[PDB]
Amino acid sequence: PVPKYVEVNMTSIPQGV
Amino acid sequence: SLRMQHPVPKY
Amino acid sequence: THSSPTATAWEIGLYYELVIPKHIYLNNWNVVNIGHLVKSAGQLTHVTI
Amino acid sequence: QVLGPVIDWNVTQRAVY
Numbered sequence: 001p002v003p004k005y006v007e008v009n010m011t012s013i014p015q016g017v
Numbered sequence: 018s019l020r021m022q023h024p025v026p027k028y
Numbered sequence: 029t030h031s032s033p034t035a036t037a038w039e040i041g042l043y044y045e046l047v048i049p050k051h052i053y054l055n056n057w058n059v060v061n062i063g064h065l066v067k068s069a070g071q072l073t074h075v076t077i
Numbered sequence: 078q079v080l081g082p083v084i085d086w087n088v089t090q091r092a093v094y
């Protein structure tokens with residue numbers, strides 16, 4: 001058990017379009 | 018915008 | 029219209045239809061509706077505009 | 078007759094750490 005991390009970016013979709 | 022740090026196993 | 033062993037003649041009738049443009053649009057995108065999930069009084073529901 | 082939920086497609090608002 002060793003700490004390893006992956007970066008994950010997220011952005012929005014106005015009105016769901 | 019939303020930056021995050023997902024932990025992954027390293028055994 | 030004429031047919032000899034050394035000579036011929038033909039006629040062709042051609043009909044053309046030319047669309048005259050009003051406006052031309054070049055830089056275009058297709059819409060893709062995705063929507064949103066809502067969990068209401070126990071039921072999962074997909075909502076769209 | 079109660080007021081129902083509101084949705085605005087904002088991802089930042091729903092972040093869980």
Ligand SMILES: *[C@@H]1O[C@H](CO)[C@@H](O[C@@H]2O[C@H](CO)[C@@H](O)[C@H](O)[C@H]2NC(C)=O)[C@H](O)[C@H]1NC(C)=O
Nearest residue numbers: 003004005006007008009020021022023024025
């Ligand atoms: C992807 O992003 C992660 C962020 O978690 C990077 O993790 C860092 O890696 C370096 C080694 O180069 C460590 O010294 C840091 O402590 C890590 N940062 C953290 C945990 O916040 C990772 O290097 C990136 N991977 C790639 C392939 O670029």
Ligand SMILES: *[C@@H]1O[C@H](CO)[C@@H](O[C@@H]2O[C@H](CO)[C@@H](O)[C@H](O)[C@H]2NC(C)=O)[C@H](O)[C@H]1NC(C)=O
Nearest residue numbers: 012014018019020085086087088089090091092
């Ligand atoms: C989307 O959600 C985020 C988080 O709720 C909003 O960003 C915050 O805005 C307030 C001011 O209204 C600031 O005091 C906070 O510091 C902000 N938080 C973060 C994490 O940035 C944002 O305004 C919302 N709306 C839009 C359109 O992005």
